Every structure is written in C-alpha cells, then in structure tokens.
Write a protein that binds this ligand. Structure first.
Ligand SMILES: CN(Cc1cnc2nc(N)nc(N)c2n1)c1ccc(C(=O)N[C@@H](CCC(=O)O)C(=O)O)cc1
Length: 123
C-alpha cells in the first residue's frame, strides 16, 4: 500500500495551492486521514485530519482558518486546500492513514505514510 501525494511546487505568499492524496489500493475498512508537514530542521508537525466519513475535521493551530481538509471517497482522494500561504508553510507535506481518528493527529498514530511533496512559498 502506497500513499502518493500530489500538487507540490513553488508558490507566492498570499497564494493558494491544492494538494491531493491517492492510494495504490482500496481498503474495505474505513480510515481516518491526515496531512503532516516537515520543515528543513524540525519535527514532522500535524496539519489536518479527517474522519472516515468526512464529517469530523481538526486542524493544527498554525494553519487553522487557512487550510481545508476534505475527502472524496468515490475517487479515493484526500485533499488539502491551502489558502493565504506564508513563507512558513514551506515544507515537505505528507499524507497518512490511521485506523481511528483520535490517534491520526499524533506523530506515532498513523499506520501508513506517503513519500511526501515539496511546497515552497516565496514572499
Ligand atoms: C489506508 N488505506 C489507503 C486509503 C484509505 N482510504 C482512503 N480514503 C480516501 N477518501 N482517499 C484515500 N486516498 C484513501 N486511502 C489503505 C490501508 C490498507 C490497505 C491494504 O493493506 N489493503 C488491505 C488492508 C485493509 C483491509 O483489510 O481491508 C485491504 O484488503 O484492503 C489499502 C489502503
């Protein structure tokens, strides 16, 4: 099972970017999904998570009100809409899956991890 992140690249502060998460296989179980990000020298940090059915979301305090997480269970995609970007925000973004929604925001929670997509925000 491979998680594959898309949509990373070079963008401008105050811009928008959409990332997406895809999977190499479908599962018969309902998974909670998350995005995490990791800047040059730091820990992988929580960004957003979403319950199996798309009903529950929670956001890391630094992106709250700016990023929207949502999912399309038909196409099997997870999306991260990133509005009002800042130079901080520059990071490798990773999509992940977790068998429950409680642990999904905890670094050791997720059972599956993407290889990551580079987002760079200039001023
Ligand atoms: C976490 N997940 C990927 C996954 C799940 N839900 C999604 N949901 C959405 N909306 N978007 C995705 N990209 C998405 N990706 C998985 C997890 C396990 C396996 C897997 O090893 N296959 C087994 C394990 C799970 C099972 O027993 O059903 C299988 O038979 O399906 C597949 C994908």
């Amino acid at each position: 099972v491979q998680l594959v992140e898309s949509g990373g690249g070079l963008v401008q502060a105050g811009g928008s970017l959409r990332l997406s998460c895809a999977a190499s296989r479908r599962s018969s179980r309902s998974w909670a999904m998350a995005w995490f990000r990791q800047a040059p020298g730091k820990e992988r940090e929580f960004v957003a998570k979403i319950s199996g059915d798309g009903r529950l979301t929670t956001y890391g305090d630094s992106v709250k009100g700016r990023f929207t997480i949502s999912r399309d269970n038909a196409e099997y995609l997870v999306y991260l809409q990133m509005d009002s970007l800042k130079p901080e925000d520059t990071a490798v973004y990773y999509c992940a899956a977790d068998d429950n929604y409680v642990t999904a925001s905890w670094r050791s929670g997720p059972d599956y991890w993407g290889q990551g997509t580079q987002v760079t925000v200039s001023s």
